[PDB]
Design a protein around this nucleic acid. Structure first.
Lengths: 74, 38, 74, 99, 200, 140
RNA sequence: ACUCAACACGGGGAACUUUACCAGAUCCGGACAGGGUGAGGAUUGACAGAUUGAGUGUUCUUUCUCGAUCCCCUGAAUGGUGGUGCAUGGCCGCUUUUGGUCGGUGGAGUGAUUUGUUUGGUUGAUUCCGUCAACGGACGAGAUCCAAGCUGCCCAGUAGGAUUCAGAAUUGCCCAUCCCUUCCGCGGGUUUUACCCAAGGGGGGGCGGUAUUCGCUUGUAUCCUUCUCUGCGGGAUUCCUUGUUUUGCGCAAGGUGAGAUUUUGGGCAACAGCAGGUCUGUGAUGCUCCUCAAUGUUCUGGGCGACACGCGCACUACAAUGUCAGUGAGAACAAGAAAAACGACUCUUGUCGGACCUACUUGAUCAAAAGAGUGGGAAAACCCCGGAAUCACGUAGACCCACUUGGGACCGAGUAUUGCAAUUAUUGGUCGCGCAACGAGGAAUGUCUCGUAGGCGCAGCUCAUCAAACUGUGCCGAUUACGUCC
């Protein structure tokens, strides 16, 4: 259910440094996560993947609790 | 029967799969290569 | 082979219908297969499911899943 | 007849260093190599009471070993088999056979 | 086979126990053995390899001879070697022995343990722990903890990383217990369960 | 193989050769009939047909399963220990028939202890089972 | 050992052994000669006689065999299933199966202390988001691991199928499967409708152009990796309902799908502890008891732990039957796991088969129990590696609403098997007693929401021999609830 702070931390950092990740598709975001990361768990990588989707899907509204580098422009 | 790593003959002898390690309990006397994971 | 009489009869049904479907896939168009298949799926077996609920382990210090020995007073 | 090599070991990553790596030397180099998939892996399961006395909750353990039997087949080496079985020295309980 | 593996277990047990008792305070880590085909190398892990050998050469051939006379081995089927373990800090059992020596010399528990802790944590170890239970009073069976850095006991993975030693000291009034752990900075599974990294 | 389970082997492969075999004698009738056929009886061997539900069936088992005999053939024997000493009931068999049933096959529809057919008489004579019952069958 | 963390518990199913304890004898282990006996010694070994349960050579006599170790006196000693677990090490149980725990710097208080670790929401969770005199951290949790479910790749000689050759065998017409189906056209029986009869054209094979199954016909030909197997990788807390979500943390239903959330089942687990248990696990131990008419110790003999006023309690199993139901028969059909090797024989210039199982046949010209010979295996080989209970069955089985033909427990006679030794040890066996209990059983009380409960069987475990026990695998497989906190 509820995800840990390791998950959310790593995923926030990713969305700041990369806008290659931009998708609401689990599958794409998974494959780019895992190759860029060393975490050595299936669970953590799938969590992080799904979190990055969740971020972008919320950004469609506007407000998030995530971290992006978009602040520069704003 | 009888045991070869004690001479007690009581406090129970394992002879399963041709070994004794229950006149000296295996939890204390490990490095037989066994492990518990499940 | 591999389980009692009852489970063999279940297994029978499955392998039969599977065989029909796969035949009508290779040698015959997807249209015919879709007709057949959809009606199978409907009629309470499901077809697709192996019903893969097996068994319990026996554990501890305990017999089957819990009913223990029987209580000491508490 | 045809010579086979069974390698029996407690542990994976000893046998692995035998089969994959050191069969390359016998692969078409001096004899021909027919790989099947290795034999079923036995467990030796033992059940030991944790408590050294009669007061606990009468607890027990489950201890298990893996027995890896790695079978790959060749087609009649003779005198060449000396090379084959001298190749592993990399772990204890690496034993090899010749028919 | 079934029996092979068991008997290998037996051989290792007997060997390991013989050495870990009667050859001690040399920084003994343990032993490791492997076959070279009709010969067994049987290397002996020590910090100080000189006592293993002997300066009269009597020690190494004594230990070969004891094994031979028990198991019906002969020369050229049996051999014993020494191996230099650098950093006694990273060997649990070795630190354990040196600590045991301090205590049998009747030096202070605190001071003693602090020596171990200093040594270990200098070489870059994640953490260590020294749990010395036993007498120090009477009349208690008092347990003293000393905990340093960080250490995990979670999963079954911890067991691989962290090697442990339990030893006894025998003093007036009776037994004193000693235990040493030491979480290595270098994995023996090449695995971590924490910190997702991002390669930039 | 051919025999048993091609006519319903349970109850419609039995009664028909039974009639024929009693009408003109063939199989063993050796004394030992009264003795225990199935484990831990409190009654006699059976109400009627002591060793005449047995013989062709004991050929049939060995036929279709190829050289199951004397220890394997009691596999399709019976024993539940249906009365017991107040412990958990266990399976058994009584060896009495094994001897006699490995004798049998040397006559009548089987040949030897390696080859278990001739023309497979039982099958051919059982082709009239389906056609007409001899018991007033339900399904015919 | 004694509420729970006593009481089928001390892997404890103990008969001689094990053995603490009892009835008796023995040893040196009392080693260590520093103070003494060498020859011929208190001695080592010994037929007879005696000793005594023990012709046993301990002992004593006889006579023989003698190393001078054995033997003499002190000191010294070692051994122990002896006590103390309130001297103690290690280990295990429980507190505690919950979400808890601690320090640095800074803030507050004279101090003990507190803040961090906090109003709210969410979650099994100190799990998260937000907020704040806290800031930045460490453990437990999560995750990493083990097993299960779906799958890719590996992939075949002990895993198993495909086609033809092959012959056995069947080629079912003695109560049904030469006769149909589909499409179409015309003529009849119908006033009409419904319904139905005849003939022909086109089309499809059906019983024989598809024929079976042999898990050995182990025969004779050909081909393969679906079924198998193991190692290493794939596979969702995503999408959608636009619902619930004030933005967040998230929630519910449905969907894709093998599988809907801690994926599923297990295993490990923080800190603080308890005067918990264990000194009969140990070469893990303090001291002080047993240290020689020793109680220590004994392949020594026998006995105990198991006894029976019909006494209480804990745990187990069998029943009172019609929802295997009770005696009979036949059919189809299961999965982990166990096993082997003796310095004993033979073999040679450095050495092979006998204490494991199962197969097969004699064990019926007359039982069971049980005898023996041949044959293979170190196990995916062991004959199909896997079978008989729950179940199925109307074969037109038998019993039939009874304490019986439902149940066994007592009791006597016989025999074989096991063993160093049986004293119901044996027990898979015969055949008496059953018309001995008991008819779902007062108060009280136990535990599980799914392949679970319940029902059933098999193997391992212990080991002269026995499992109503314990541990593991498999089979048949639900009702109710999916809520609250009383």
């Amino acid at each position: 259910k509820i995800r840990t702070k390791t998950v959310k931390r790593a995923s926030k950092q990713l969305v700041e440094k990369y806008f290659s990740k931009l998708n609401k598709d689990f599958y794409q975001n998974k494959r780019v996560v895992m190759d860029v990361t060393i975490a050595r768990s299936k669970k953590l990588k799938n969590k992080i993947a799904g979190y990055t989707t969740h971020i972008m899907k919320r950004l469609a509204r506007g407000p998030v609790r995530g971290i992006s580098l978009k602040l520069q422009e704003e | 029967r009888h045991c070869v790593i004690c001479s007690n003959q009581k406090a129970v002898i394992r002879k399963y799969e041709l070994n004794v390690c229950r006149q000296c309990f295996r939890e204390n006397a490990a490095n037989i290569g066994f492990s518990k994971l499940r | 082979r591999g389980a009692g009489q009852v489970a063999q009869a279940y297994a029978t049904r499955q392998a039969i219908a599977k065989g029909l479907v796969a035949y009508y896939q290779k040698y015959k168009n997807e249209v015919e297969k879709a007709a057949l298949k959809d009606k199978y799926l409907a009629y309470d077996k499901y077809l697709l499911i192996a019903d893969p609920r097996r068994c319990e382990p026996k554990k501890w210090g305990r017999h089957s899943a819990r009913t223990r020995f029987t209580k000491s007073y508490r | 007849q045809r010579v086979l090599v069974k390698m029996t070991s407690r542990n994976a990553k000893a046998v692995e260093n035998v089969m994959t790596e050191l069969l390359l030397h016998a692969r078409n180099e001096k004899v021909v190599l027919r790989g099947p998939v290795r034999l079923p892996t036995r467990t030796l399961k033992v059940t030991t009471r944790k408590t050294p006395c009669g007061n606990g909750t009468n607890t027990w353990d489950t201890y298990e070993l893996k027995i890896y039997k790695r079978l790959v087949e060749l087609r009649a080496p003779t005198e060449l088999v000396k090379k084959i079985t001298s190749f592993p020295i990399d772990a204890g309980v690496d034993v090899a056979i010749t028919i | 086979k079934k029996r092979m593996i068991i008997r290998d277990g037996v051989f290792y047990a007997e060997l390991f126990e013989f050495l870990k008792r009667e050859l001690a305070d040399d920084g003994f880590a343990g032993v490791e053995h492997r076959v070279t085909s009709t010969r067994t190398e049987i290397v002996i892990r020590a910090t100080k390899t000189r006592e293993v050998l002997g300066e009269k050469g009597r020690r190494i051939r004594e230990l070969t001879a004891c094994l031979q006379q028990r198991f019906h081995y002969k020369e050229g089927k049996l051999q014993l070697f020494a191996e230099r373990v650098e950093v006694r800090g990273l060997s649990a059992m070795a630190q354990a022995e040196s600590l045991r020596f301090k205590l049998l010399s009747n030096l202070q528990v605190r001071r003693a343990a602090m020596g171990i802790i200093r040594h270990v944590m200098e070489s870059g170890a994640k953490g260590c722990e020294v749990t010395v239970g036993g007498k120090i009073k009477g009349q208690r069976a008092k347990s003293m903890t000393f905990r340093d850095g960080y250490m995990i006991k979670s999963g079954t993975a911890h067991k691989n990383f962290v090697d442990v030693a339990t030893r006894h000291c025998h003093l007036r009034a009776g037994t004193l217990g000693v235990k040493v752990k030491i979480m290595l900075p270098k994995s023996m599974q090449n695995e971590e369960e924490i910190l997702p990294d991002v390669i930039t | 193989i051919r025999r048993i389970g091609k006519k319903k082997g349970a109850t419609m492969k039995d009664v028909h050769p039974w009639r024929w075999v009693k009408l003109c004698s063939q199989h063993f009738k050796q004394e030992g009939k009264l003795m225990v056929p199935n484990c831990t009886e409190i009654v006699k061997s059976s109400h009627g047909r002591e060793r005449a539900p047995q013989n062709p069936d004991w050929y049939y088992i060995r036929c279709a399963a190829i050289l199951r005999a004397v220890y394997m053939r009691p596999g399709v024997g019976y024993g539940g220990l249906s009365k017991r000493f107040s412990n958990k009931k266990n399976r058994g068999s009584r060896p009495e028939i094994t001897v006699r049933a490995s004798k049998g096959l040397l006559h009548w529809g089987c040949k030897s202890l390696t080859k278990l057919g001739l023309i497979e008489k039982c099958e051919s004579s059982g082709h009239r089972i389906t056609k007409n019952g001899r018991k007033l069958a339900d399904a015919i």
